[PDB]
Amino acid sequence: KAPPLVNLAEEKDVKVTVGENMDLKNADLLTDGDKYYLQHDATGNKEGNNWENYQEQGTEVTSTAEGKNGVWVQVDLGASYPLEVINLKRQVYDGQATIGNGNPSGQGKRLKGTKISYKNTAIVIGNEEDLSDGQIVYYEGNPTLPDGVKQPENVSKPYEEAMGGQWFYMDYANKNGLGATELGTTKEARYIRVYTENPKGAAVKFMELGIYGYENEQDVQSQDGPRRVIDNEHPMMIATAYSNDVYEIGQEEGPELQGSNTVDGRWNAIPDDLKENNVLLLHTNNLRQFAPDHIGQAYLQAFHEHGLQIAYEQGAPIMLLGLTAAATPENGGTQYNITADMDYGWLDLMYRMYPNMQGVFNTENFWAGIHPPCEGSAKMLEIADRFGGFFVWSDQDHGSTVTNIVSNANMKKALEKHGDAFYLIYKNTSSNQPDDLKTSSFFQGSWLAGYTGGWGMLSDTWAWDKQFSKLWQGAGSYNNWQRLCGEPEALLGMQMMSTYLGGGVIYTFEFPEIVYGTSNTNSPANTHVLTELFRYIVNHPAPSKKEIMEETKAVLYGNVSSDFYSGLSGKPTGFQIYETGRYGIIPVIPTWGTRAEVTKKLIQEADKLGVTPPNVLDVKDKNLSGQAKQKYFKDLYPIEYVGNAFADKWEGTWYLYNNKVNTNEKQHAILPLEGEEESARLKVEMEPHEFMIMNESGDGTAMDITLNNYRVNKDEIIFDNKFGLTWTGDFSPGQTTINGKLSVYKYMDEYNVVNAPEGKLSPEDNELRTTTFELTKLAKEPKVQVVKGQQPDTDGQPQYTEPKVEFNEETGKAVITIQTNGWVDLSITGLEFVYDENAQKIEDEP
Ligand SMILES: [Ca+2]
Ligand SMILES: [Mg+2]
Ligand SMILES: [Mg+2]
Ligand SMILES: [Mg+2]
């Protein structure tokens, strides 16, 4: 299936001509779709241990006219087509480029040599073969134009030839044809002529003339609003499609992903009803890592083009990894990733070509550099918003991440004009640094003041590696690939719940092969936790900006202390969860401007939402000290419930979890219930790795409860290593993936499989844990039933027991007990609450 914008120069049966006193050699090379001319694609673009050299091939046009070196080449498309983009590449280097040292020194490789700056370059298009009706796309120097074509008033200056060529668009008033246009800005032409003079000789090597357009005017596109909405009513889950680091340009099959996954495979594993709230993130991973300019650019473009094309045929919306490890074409950039060889003209083209192209993703740049990734991000945010796309920046903030983003003049300007398309999500990879809660505060704060379009989460099972191993145990001396597998599945649900209640709208998980799955199947975590809770979040919109602003009495400004949250919402664990919902996330506005500037911005946002502005406090305010903060916040936000469990009430629904990450302790929540009887109480008691959603009928007679405590036991299969998997960071001979990764894949493929067929193992999820509910004070026994519950795997073992009800006629206390490992939907009916003079008081301690 063809996308609407095509390279007509490649797709059509074109005729190539030159002018009088010119020789034309190898005319086919101009429109063969090849800008790089690589020879060793079959051996990782290496001869032995060395990267193949850059050897430039191209259509040669040579002047045979005495004293006149200027040449031209014309393409006849065979009919008149709406044209939108032209890509010209000529020979880049005067002689042969050599492979030399890049960044970092001794790993990164960069081409070295003298680059050519061509002169008397012009592009003319028209519908007459002699171009007597010619229109100028580009004009530099003083080449003689066709009879009937006037010189422009505005003339371009020479540029240095580049690995990706030059990009031209159809508005001469927009940087003299170099300025990117709105989608569907076209001019009709059959004939395209390129003038060039080589500064040294009478011969120009034309490596590629790409001519991008439509079959007809009916196909010409328009950007009519955003490609997708991201907000409380339109949440988005991102799943990362990592290259397995194996690819050959021209291969028939799709790009192979980690864990025998494919782009079409991952898309087709998503339930149909959630496809409108999902995107796939194409990530180059370590594909051709450290390669010089020609190999890096060729593989960056081929990998993403192939992914985009498969996604286009399947109807999958796509994000591209724009930048990690400061690997950007900008000055000071590294070659840690082939994103170093990004061409902004190509990125623009992918938006024009692929209607399913939506987003650009940035993560983990600042460890390797500050300003280069800010310069790259500024341009890519501008490109995204031009095409109604979006940009996601994922990082943990120690106190200077957002400060550094906004300190870049170009990024600041880009955020002022395009900030509504820009989203900040946390990343708890470094769980050992207690920066999880302040990161959420910074990102919610940025959105609430109106600097960004939203905030969200990336939960990483690498968080487990930094602290824990077996259930209830510390890290020990296990291999880090073992500890990556150790995180409780329900804990991912608790994090989702916490993001949701803070008006988060983006949900992302790593490691992808554990949290989403392998071999184009769904993991236990995905099937029994992520998919179910994300469906809830799609059908029950999160708090809007209006709803969060309404409930916020105080916003902080500046670099909030990591431990500010201890004695308030909870001690930072590195796992993005809370001890209570009483205070929400607590928005902290980073250094987007002075305190006075962010204040104006926040109060003007509140005014737009039609709500009372919050008070702004500097983090250094005397009321926010260790001694004063509890009294200040307790007076602002009334207590909603009593107990050491997490609980929040949002739009009539209760949300709870046990907030212990890896210590085996029960917690309880005591909730005041709706209805005529104000003394009515529910007490919930939960063991760790459990979340719960409760909705009262309102008339006081009934209550629906969904709980989910799904957890696979890894103690024997992963940590004891019962099947003798090789857990190392090393490659085995002839393998292209390290043993640690292979063992994770094999674990997910053989030993931890949902509906495990013959010869594979059901997940180790059959040990049930007790939840107890106490309802007081009642006149008679209530009725409890399981409306729906999690069904057994192929081993036939139950994931829940029938609930047991005990009613004491003397006290009027109903105790309801159930054992689960997974989810159940309970319906409690026949509730008749009477006055309880002993009802737990919903108040703070004296
Ligand atoms: Ca070519
Ligand atoms: Mg605004
Ligand atoms: Mg209700
Ligand atoms: Mg089971």
Numbering used by the authors: 48 to 893
What do the authors of the reporting publication say about this deposited model?
We showed by HPAEC-PAD and LC-FD-MS/MS that RgGH98 is specific for blood group A tetrasaccharide type II (BgA II). As expected from the construct, RgGH98 adopts a modular structure with 3 domains. Structural alignment to homologous GH98 enzymes identified the binding pocket and the general acid catalytic residue as Glu 411, which is present in a cleft in the centre of the Cd. Fragmentation of this species showed that the deoxy-hexose was linked to the hexose at the reducing end, as determined by the characteristic fragments at 431 and 449 Da. Together, the HPAEC-PAD and MS/MS analyses confirmed that BgAtri was released from mucin following RgGH98 hydrolysis of the Galβ1-4GlcNAc glycosidic linkage in BgA II.
The N-term domain identified as GBLD, residues 55 to 260, presents a β-sandwich fold. Two loops, comprising residues 79 to 105 and 138 to 163, extend from the GBLD and wrap around the Cd. The C-term domain, residues 592 to 876 aa, with a central β-sandwich module follows. Additional calcium and magnesium ions were modelled in the RgGH98–BgAtri complex and RgGH98 apo crystal structures. However, in these experiments both ions were present at a concentration of 50 mM, increasing the likelihood of nonspecific binding.
